[PDB]
Design an enzyme around this catalytic site. Structure first.
Site, PDB file in Angstrom:
ATOM      1  N   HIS A  45      89.004  43.899  37.584  1.00  0.00           N
ATOM      2  CA  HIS A  45      89.846  44.694  36.701  1.00  0.00           C
ATOM      3  C   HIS A  45      89.837  46.203  36.982  1.00  0.00           C
ATOM      4  CE1 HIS A  45      86.169  44.960  34.005  1.00  0.00           C
ATOM      5  NE2 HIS A  45      86.691  46.168  33.737  1.00  0.00           N
ATOM      6  N   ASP A  89      86.113  37.853  37.977  1.00  0.00           N
ATOM      7  CA  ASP A  89      86.253  39.299  37.851  1.00  0.00           C
ATOM      8  C   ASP A  89      85.323  40.005  38.848  1.00  0.00           C
ATOM      9  OD1 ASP A  89      87.119  41.793  37.030  1.00  0.00           O
ATOM     10  OD2 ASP A  89      86.224  41.740  35.106  1.00  0.00           O
ATOM     11  N   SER A 176      82.141  48.779  33.328  1.00  0.00           N
ATOM     12  CA  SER A 176      82.733  47.774  34.193  1.00  0.00           C
ATOM     13  C   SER A 176      82.301  47.946  35.631  1.00  0.00           C
ATOM     14  CB  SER A 176      84.261  47.825  34.101  1.00  0.00           C
ATOM     15  OG  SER A 176      84.659  47.579  32.770  1.00  0.00           O
TER      16      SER A 176
END
Ligand SMILES: Cc1c(S(=O)(=O)Nc2ccc(-c3ccncc3)cc2S(C)(=O)=O)sc2ccc(F)cc12
Ligand SMILES: [Zn+2]
Length: 220
Positions: A45, A89, A176
């Site tokens: 992402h 991811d 992230s």
């Protein structure tokens, strides 16, 4: 990072700070980690039009002699990545040149994990809080997959369930792509969680993806 501590400067020398020019408009920021001189592992992402990686950093508003700031020349997003479910991811970034290994800039090495794990990043320090200028880190408990049953698209095979829900300690927004280490070994990648920050959160299970990583490394 919520409920964490400011890292000892340069004590996590694999940590990468990603400046992403989003494929449409503004800039965003992720974590990541250096796994070879010219490769960074992060979340899918965090992809974008273009990415810069800053290695050797502690306070990301303070340039130091430790820094090595490198353009990304190729993004290898997981080919089965799903923007809705966040399955797979994971993304590898090839750097334009090889980082110089220094005390402050090193690669992170790579067999089933124990309970107490650690994640670091420059993300937000609370729900509605700013990003951290300094690298923060926190110790989190790896939970059984049941503890994440409330995330409809969770999958124990692809993913770790991370953070005791009784405490406020968590990775959060901006964290992230950063690695979760368990016993000094990289087991997870911050992926997602609740926007109200109630743990646990969801990380990518790195062991599942090791053939794909080996494939990209061996071939680039
Ligand atoms: C990145 C992130 C968010 S977010 O709110 O910034 N983004 C977010 C949140 C949830 C989901 C998602 C929900 C349900 N099913 C799949 C994915 C996705 C996305 S993201 C990173 O895709 O925008 S909340 C949170 C909580 C703990 C954590 F470690 C990381 C994060
Ligand atoms: Zn320093």
């Amino acid at each position: 990072i919520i409920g964490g501590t400011e890292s000892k400067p340069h004590s996590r020398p694999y940590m990468a700070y990603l400046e992403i020019v989003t494929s449409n408009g503004p800039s965003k920021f992720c974590g990541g980690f250096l796994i070879r001189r010219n490769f960074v592992l992060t979340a899918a992402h965090c992809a974008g039009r273009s990415i810069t990686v800053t290695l050797g950093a502690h306070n990301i508003t303070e340039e130091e002699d430790t820094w090595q700031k490198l353009e990304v020349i190729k993004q290898f997003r997981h080919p089965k990545y799903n923007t809705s479910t966040l399955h797979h991811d994971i993304m590898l970034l090839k750097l334009k040149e090889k980082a110089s290994l220094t005390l402050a800039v090193g690669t992170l090495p790579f067999v089933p994990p124990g309970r107490m794990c650690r994640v670091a990043g420059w993300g937000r320090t609370g729900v509605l809080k700013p990003g951290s200028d300094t690298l923060q880190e926190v110790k989190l408990r790896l939970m059984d997959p049941q503890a994440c049953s409330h995330f409809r698209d969770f999958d124990h095979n692809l993913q770790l369930c991370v953070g005791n829900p009784r405490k406020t300690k968590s990775a959060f927004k901006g964290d992230s792509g950063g690695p979760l280490l368990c016993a000094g070994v990289a087991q997870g990648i911050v992926s997602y969680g609740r926007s109200d920050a109630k743990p646990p959160a969801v990380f990518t299970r790195i062991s599942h993806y090791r053939p794909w990583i080996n494939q990209i490394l061996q071939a680039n």
